[PDB]
Amino acid sequence: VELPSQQRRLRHLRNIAARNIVNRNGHQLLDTYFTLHLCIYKEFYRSEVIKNSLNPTWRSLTSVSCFVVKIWGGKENIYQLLIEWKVCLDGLKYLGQQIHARNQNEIIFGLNDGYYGAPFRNSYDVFSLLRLHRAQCAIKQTQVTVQKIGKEIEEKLRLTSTSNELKKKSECLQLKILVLQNELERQKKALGREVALLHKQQIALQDKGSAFSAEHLKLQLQKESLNELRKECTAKRELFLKTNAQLTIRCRQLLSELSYIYPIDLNEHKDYFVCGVKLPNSSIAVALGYTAHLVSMISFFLQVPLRYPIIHKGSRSTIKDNINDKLTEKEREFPLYPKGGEKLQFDYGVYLLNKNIAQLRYQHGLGTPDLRQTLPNLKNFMEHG
Amino acid sequence: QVSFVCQRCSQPLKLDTSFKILDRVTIQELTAPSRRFIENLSRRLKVTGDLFDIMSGQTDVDHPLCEECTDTLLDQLDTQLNVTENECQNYKRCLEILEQMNEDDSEQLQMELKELALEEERLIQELEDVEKNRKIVAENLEKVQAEAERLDQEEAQYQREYSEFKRQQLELDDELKSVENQMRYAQTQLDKLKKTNVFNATFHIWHSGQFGTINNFRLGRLPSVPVEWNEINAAWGQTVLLLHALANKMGLKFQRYRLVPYGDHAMVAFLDCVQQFKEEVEKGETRFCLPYRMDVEKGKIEDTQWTKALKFMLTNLKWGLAWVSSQF
Amino acid sequence: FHYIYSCDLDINVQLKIGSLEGKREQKSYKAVLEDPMLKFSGLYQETCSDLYVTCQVFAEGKPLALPVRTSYKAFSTRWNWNEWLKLPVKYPDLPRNAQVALTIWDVYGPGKAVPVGGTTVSLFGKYGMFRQGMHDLKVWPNVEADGSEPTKTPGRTQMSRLAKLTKAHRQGHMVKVDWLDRLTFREIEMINESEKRSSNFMYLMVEFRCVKCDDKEYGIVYYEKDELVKVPDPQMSMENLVESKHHKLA
Amino acid sequence: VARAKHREGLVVVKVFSYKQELEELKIRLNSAQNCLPFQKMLFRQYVRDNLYDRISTRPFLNNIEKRWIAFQILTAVDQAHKSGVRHGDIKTENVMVTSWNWVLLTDFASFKPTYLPEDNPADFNYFFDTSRRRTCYIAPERFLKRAMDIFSAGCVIAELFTEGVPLFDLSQLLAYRNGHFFPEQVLNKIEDHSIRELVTQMIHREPDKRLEAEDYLKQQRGNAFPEIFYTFLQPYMAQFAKETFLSADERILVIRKDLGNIIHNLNGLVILVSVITSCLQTLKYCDSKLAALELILHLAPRLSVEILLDRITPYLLHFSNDSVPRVRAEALRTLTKVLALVKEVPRNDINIYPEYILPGIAHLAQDDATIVRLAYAENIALLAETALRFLELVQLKGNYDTELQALHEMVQQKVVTLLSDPENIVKQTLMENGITRLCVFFGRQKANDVLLSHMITFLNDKNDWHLRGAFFDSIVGVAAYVGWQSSSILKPLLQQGLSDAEEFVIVKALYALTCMCQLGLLQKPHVYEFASDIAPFLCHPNLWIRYGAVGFITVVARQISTADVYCKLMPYLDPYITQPIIQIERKLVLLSVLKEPVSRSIFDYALRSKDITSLFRHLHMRQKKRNGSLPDCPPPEDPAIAQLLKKLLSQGMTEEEEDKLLALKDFMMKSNKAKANINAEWESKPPPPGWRPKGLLVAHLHEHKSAVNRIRVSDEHSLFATCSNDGTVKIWNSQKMSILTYSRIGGRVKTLTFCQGSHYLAIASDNGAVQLLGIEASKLPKSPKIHPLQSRILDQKEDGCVVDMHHFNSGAQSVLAYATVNGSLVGWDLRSSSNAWTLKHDLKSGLITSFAVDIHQCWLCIGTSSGTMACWDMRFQLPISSHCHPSRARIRRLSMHPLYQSWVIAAVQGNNEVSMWDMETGDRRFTLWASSAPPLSELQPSPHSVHGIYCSPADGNPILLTAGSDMKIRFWDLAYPERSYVVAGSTSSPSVSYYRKIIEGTEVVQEIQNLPVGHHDIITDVATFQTTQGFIVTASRDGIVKVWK
C-alpha cells in the first residue's frame, strides 16, 4: 500500500543488507559487518561477520525514523568502515519484497512490507483512543515503577553484597568441608577394606608358615625314623643271610647222607657202573628208579619245585606232566620205569627226568653240557653242588 | 478514497467523526508520556494525520487502528497489564522479604569464616593422615604378599624333598616285608630239615591210622583195604634201604646175606637184621632199648594183625632211626 | 562353513553392553581437593554409577557415524546395562579395519561428561570374521576409545593356548569326551576369572546380536562387491567429463 | 585411418619388401618410451588424443604442459635419432598425446620420400597433408636426415604454443625455402620468449645450423623446461609407458605410494594429474576409489584454482554418482574439501556452484543409504557456505540478488528434505552439523515457518529418544536464528521434552534450555515457568538429569537479572535445595546443596503403579494432614491405593520423599502416560584266550639277585621285559617261557615299557636314567642282539626318577610318557628326541605311584602315594580334580577300565582293598575287599596290600587279577564275584568265599575264609602274554620271576 502517513519506522525495519561493495584494498572479499548510529550518538548494532563476501545479507535485529548505517569491513579481525548512510526512513523508496541493487557500495534496508532503497471500514472511536492511550500510559508508568523497584532491589543486593562476598566465601568453605568429608569417608572405607583384608591374609600367613615349619619338622623326624628302619633292614637282611647259609649247610649235609646210599662208579672204559651195572647214555630199572627218588628228594631238600612233579615210588617212580598241550588227562603222567606198551611214553618220561636234572643244575647254577646223561649229570651235581 | 491504514493489519480506516469535536485539552493531554543520504475537512483530516504520526512517534504502537485491532490489542494490553501488576506485586513482596532479612553483622560472619577455615584445614590434615595410613597399609600388603609367595617357593622345595623321602620310605617298607617273608621261609625250612632225620625225610616212618607208613606208603595189607603186592613191596624196599643205610651208618651186616637196598624168609631174615639192629643199639648204646620186642627163629614180635606187627617195626626202627640221627 | 558378508547384512548394527567390570580408577584425595567438581562425579558415589557407553564406529581413522548412548538405566549393585544400542552404522557401512570405540562415559558435572575407560575393538577381528560373540574387552582407563589405525586403546590381543583348542573343540576339529570336556570348561572359566581378578584394570562385557530371517548359524566376514597396446591407457575411450562439467555452465 | 576395437582398447588400422621396413623400425623403436611405431594393412595403439584436439579439448593444455609436450617431442625425436629412426613428416596431427600427457610419435613411415620437388605439390598433399589443413612442415632442405625432423618438430612446438595457429602453409614454406619468407609475425603468437628463440633456432633455413634434439634439450635446462622435468618426471612417467600397469587400480597404487616423493620433488603436478584423472573414471575396487580420493585431497592444495575446478571437481562428482556408499560419502567429502581449497573464480566458473555442483549433490541428499545422507548432513554446512563464498568471489568477474535467492532456496529445500528423511540419525546429524549454519540461508520468517516446525515434528516420535534429544541439541541454534517469534511456539514443546519418559531426553532438553537461555531466546515469563518446572528435576533420582537441571538453573541465574534470579528462581528452588544458597550461579554450591534424590526404587514404585493419579491423591491428602489442612489420614476410596502406599511405606519413604513425590507429580504423570503410550582300542596286542589261569608255574627263573618289581609284555615282538633292583633289566622271550639281559644303566631298576609301534624297548632306573634298547630277537644270527640307543639323565633335585612308564603312539609323534618323583609326567617324542607335554602334578597330592593314560589319549589318571588321585585332560593338558581315598592310603597301582570309559581301578595299600573310582562322578563305585578286616573300614587292620593289577575285556567279563603281599594271586570277575578265587599256596591253604555286600551304595566283593609253589615273598608284578596259551607273568621281592600258564 503506497499511501503516505503510513507509519514506517525502525521497528518496522528488521533487515539490513549490502550489495556491490567495491573494496578499496583491491580484489578481495572483505569480512563485512555493520553498525547503526542513533542519528552522531554512539553506534549500537553488530551483526555476525559474513566472512568472504562483498554482497552480504546480514541477520537483522525504536520509533525513530532516521538512523546512520555504516559498514565495517576488513579481514582477520582488523576492520575498516566504508559507508556513511545518514538515512531518514521517510526518504526511502520501496522495492517489492526482493532486494535489488544497482548502485555501488549499496545498502538496502528491509521493512515489514518489502525492501527499502535510496532512490534516484471504521476506526476506533475517540473514546477507544483515550482508553488505549491511558492503558499504554499505565503500562509505561507501571513498567517504569517496576524498573525503579528492580534497580532499588539490585542496589540493596549490592549493599548486602558488601558482606555477601564473605558469605559466598563461607559457602565455598562449607563446600570444601563437605567435599573433604566425603573424600575422607570413601578413603576411610578403602582403609577399612584394606585393613580387614590385610589382617586376614596376615593371620593366613602365620597359619601357613607354622604349618610349613611343622611339615619340615615332620620331614626331618620322618627321615630319622626311616634311617632307623634302614639299619633295621640291614640287620634283618644279614640275619636272613646267615640263616640261609645254615639252610644250605644243612641241605648239603643231608644231601650227602642221601647220596652215599645210591652208589655210582667208573670202569677203565670210562663207563658208569651203578651198583655194578653198565649204563649207556639215554637192575637198570632199579637203579634208574633210585635216581628218580634221588631227584625227588633233591627237589624236596633244595626246595626247587619239579618242572614235572614226581609221584614217587622206589623204582616205579612216575613223573607227571601238566604242562604239555598235546597230552590228554590220561597222558598227563609219564613213568621213569619201563611200562608195558609205553616204550615211547617211558622214553619221554626219562627225558623229562633228565630235564628235571637240567632244571636242578640250572637253578643251582651249573650249566649242563649234555642232557642225555641221566645219572652222570646228577652225580656231577652232587659232586659240585 | 482511503486516507489511513491499520498499521497492525494493513487495512483502510473509515474515519470516525468524533475526532471533529476533539479540542486542545484532549490533544494536549495525549501528547505526553563511502557516502550517501536521502478546508475545514482538509484541516481536520490533516490534524488527524498529524496526531496519528505524533502518536506513533510517542508510543510503540502505530496509530491509527482497526476497532477489531484496537480491541484485540486492548485485550493484549490488558493481559500484559495484569501480568505487569502481578510482577509489580511480586517485586514488592520480594522487597519486604529482603527488608525483613537483616543487615547481618560483618564481624560475626568474619569469625564464621575463620572458624570454618580452621575446621576445613584440620580436616585436610586428617585426610593427610588418612593417606599416610593408606601408604603404610599398601606397603604391609605388598610385603606380606611377597612373604606368602616366598613361602610358596619354600613349599615347592619341601614337597620335592618330601616326595623323595616318601618314595624311599615306602620302598624300604616293601623291602622290609620282603626280607621278613624270606626270613620266615628260611626259618621254617631249616627247622623242618634239622628236626628231620635224613632217613626220616627219605623214609617218613609216621603213623597213619592203624598203619605206620613209610613216606606215606602203606606197610601192611588188610582184608578191608585193597593193597596190591607192588605197594607192600615198595614199602619193604624202602624199609630195606633204611636198614642198608643203617648198615652204612653204623657198620653192621649179617656177613652171609647183608641186606643191600632192595626194591616169608625174606622179612623173617629182615627180623634178625632189626634184631641185630636192636642188639646193635644194645651193643652200641645201652641207654636205649627198642620198644616192640623181637625173637629171631620164631619170627615173633611182642606188643611190649600181620600189619600191626610191621607197624611196630617201623615204629621200632623209628626209635632206632631217631637215635641214629642223634648219635652223630 | 556357513557365513554371510557384512556388505550384505544391510541392518543397523546392534551392540549389547552387558557390564563394566573391575576396580575403577579411584582418584586420590588431592584429585578432588583440586577439582571440587570431581566430588559430584560418578566415581565418588561408591554405588555403581549411571554410565553410558557411546559406541562410535571408526575406520582407518575416520569416525563413521554418531555415538549412541545407553538408554538411561539406574544401577545400584552392578553396571548391568545388558542393554542394546542400535548403532547408526549398518554392516555394509563397515570396512575391514572398522572398529568400534566404546567410550564408557560417566558424569563429571552439569553439562560436562568425562570418559571413564574406552575400548577400541576391531569389529572385524582376526581373519576378518565379525565379532559374533560375547566379549570381554580391556578398558583403557580415562582415555576416550581412540579408533585411529593402529588403535591406541586396543581391547584385546594362558588364553592363547586355551582358545585355539576351544574353537577346535566346539567347531568339531577335535576329540569329544563329554564329562572330561565339561569339567575342563569349568577349569577354563576358573582360569578366565583368575586372569580377570589379576588385573587392576577395568574390563567390559559386550555382545553382538545375530538374528536374521535365515538358518541362524552364520558368520559375518568383511567383504564388498567386486601386443596391440603398448602404452596402457586407463581412460581408453570414455567420457571427457571436465568438458561436460564446463558445458553444464551456460 | 580405421579406428577399431581390440581386447584391451581401440586400435588404429591403416591401409595404403615393404613389410621389412616396419620390421626394422619396430626392432629399433621397441625400447622408445615417447615413441610408438607400427606394432605390426598396418596397426598401431589408439591413443586418446591428437595434439590439435588436445589444444581444443576443454581441459586446456596450459603453458607448463605445453612446455612438457615440447620436452617430450624433443625427447621422442631424440629417441628416434639415437635408435636410428627418422619419421620425416612430424606434425601436430601425429604427435599423439595419450590421456596421461605421454607423447607418442606415431607410425614412422620410412616409405615417405626423403626429398621432394618444389613446384609439384601433389606429393605434399598426399604424403604430408592427411588432415588437408595444408600446414606444411617439410624440411626446407628436402625440396632422411636428423635436422629435417628437428625442423619439423620446431614447427610443431611453434604450433603448440600458438594455440593451433599454423606456422607454415605450403606457399609460406615454399617462400621460406627461397629465403624470401620469414614468419615471425605468427611467431609473435608464442606466449613466452623462450619458445620464441627455441622455434627460431630450430626453423633456420640452413640445416647445419640446427642443433640436435639432444643438444636443444641440453640447452633449454631451466630457461624454459625446468630441471624438475629432467630430474623427476621423465623416468617417472616412463614408468607408466610400459605394459604391466594395465589397469587404473595399479596406477593409483603406484602413485599413492609415490605421492610424497612426487610432491616434495616437484610445477609439474599438472602433468601428474593427466595420469591420475585418467584412472579416476575407471577405478574398479573400493580401495582404489578411496585411495584416489585421498590422493586428490592431498594434491589439491598444491594445485591452483583453475586446475582444480577444471580437472578434479567433475571427477569428484563422477564418484558421488557411483555405487559404494563409502565412495559416495568420500566423493562428497573430497568435493567439499577441494572446493574449499578454491580461492579464484575463472571466467567460465561464473556461476558454477548453483548451476553445477549442488544439482550434482542433490541425489546424494536424497540417497537411500544412511551413511550418504549422514555425509550430506555433515557436509551441506560447508557446501552451502562454499556456495555463498564462491558466488561472492564471482562478482569480481547478472542480477546477483536473484542468484543469491536461488541459492537460498536450494539450500532451504535441501535442509527441509534432510529433516524429512525417515532416519532419525540423518535428522540428528543435520541438526548437529548444518542446521545452525543453514538458518542463515533461511531467513527468519521462512525459518520459523519451515525449519522450526519440521524440528518440532521430531518431538512426536516417542520411540527414539535420540532424535528428540537431537532436536533439543539444535533447537538452541534455530531458536537463536528465528529469534523472538518462536519462543511462544516452543515453550510448551520444551515443557513436553522436560517431562518426557527417557531421562536422557530430559538431560538434553535441560541443556537445550541451558544454551537457549544463554543466548537470551526465551521470554522472561517463560524463563520463570521453565525454572519452576526444572525445579523438580534437581531432586530426580537420576544423575545426568539432576546435574543438567543444575546446569540450566545456574545458567538462568547468570543470564537473567539477579533481581529476577532472586525474585523467582529462589522461590522455585526452595524445595530441592538443602541450604538457602546465594550463588545459584555457582554449580558448586547447587550440587553440594541438592537434597538426596528420592531413591530410584521409591521413585519407580511410585511411577509403576497404574492409575497413579489415585496414588497422588492419597499422597496429597497425606501432605494436608502433615500440614493440618485435613484432620487425619484416612485410608482412601480404593483399598488398592492403601495397599500400594503401604508397600512403598515398607520401603520407608521419608515424609520428605513424600513431599518430593508430590512436587514431581506433573513430570511424574506425564512421563507415566508417555511410557503408557509406548582306531584305538584298550584290547592290547594279546586278546586273551586264557580265560581261567590254572595257578601253575612253568618257570622259576631266579636269574635276578634282588627284588623284581616290573613286568611289561610286548606282543609286537613276542617278548616280555622284567626289571629288578639288581639293575638287570632282563628281556625274556615269550616263546621260550633270558633271551637278553642288560645292566649298563646301573643301580636299582624297577620300571620299563615296550614301544607299541617300533622295534625298541624303553627302560628306567633308580639313577633317574631313561634309556632304550633296540631289540633283535626275530632275526637270528648265532645270537640275538641288544642295542643300547639312548641317554637321558635328570638331577633328582629338579627332574627326578621314573615312577612308572607307558608308551603310546599318537601319530607321527611317538610318545613315551613317564612319571617322576617330582610327579611331572613327561611325554618324550622318541621319534623326535624332544618331549611334548610336561603334565606337572600338584605335589600337595603327594608322590605319584602309578599313572594310567587313556587308550584314546583323552585323559590320564594319577594315583598319589597318599591315596589321593588325580586326572588329566590331555587335549588341553588341563588338570581335573579326583576323588581321594576314604582311608588315604597309598595307591600302588592304577588302570583304565576296559568296558567303562571313565573308570579307574586303584589297588590301595591295606586290607587288600582294590577300589574302582569313576572320575566323572568323583566317587568310588566298586570295591574289592580281600582282607577279612572289617569291610570298607579305615582301621587298616590288615598289613596286606595289592600291587599287581591286570584288567581284561574277556568274554564281556572285566577279568581282574590282583597280586600283593599275601603271597596269593587272586582272580576276580567284576560281574560274577562268585567266580573269583586264588591261585597260590600249598594244598594246606584253606579255601575262601567271595560275597557281594552293597555298602554305602558302593559295592564290596569280599574274600572271607570258609611244595609251596606260590612266591615265598611279595608278588610285586602281574602281566600277561600268549603264544598258544595265555600266560600270567609274575615276580616276587626275593628276585624270582615266575610265569603261570
Ligand SMILES: Nc1nc2c(ncn2[C@@H]2O[C@H](COP(=O)(O)OP(=O)(O)O)[C@@H](O)[C@H]2O)c(=O)[nH]1
Ligand atoms: N586423436 C587421434 N587421432 C588419430 C589417431 N590415429 C590417427 N588419427 C588421425 O588420423 C590421421 C593420420 O594421418 P597422419 O598421421 O597425419 O599421416 P599418416 O602417416 O598417413 O598416418 C591424423 O591426422 C589424425 O588426425 C589417434 O590415435 N588419436
Ligand SMILES: [Mg+2]
Ligand atoms: Mg597416426
Ligand SMILES: [Zn+2]
Ligand atoms: Zn487493523
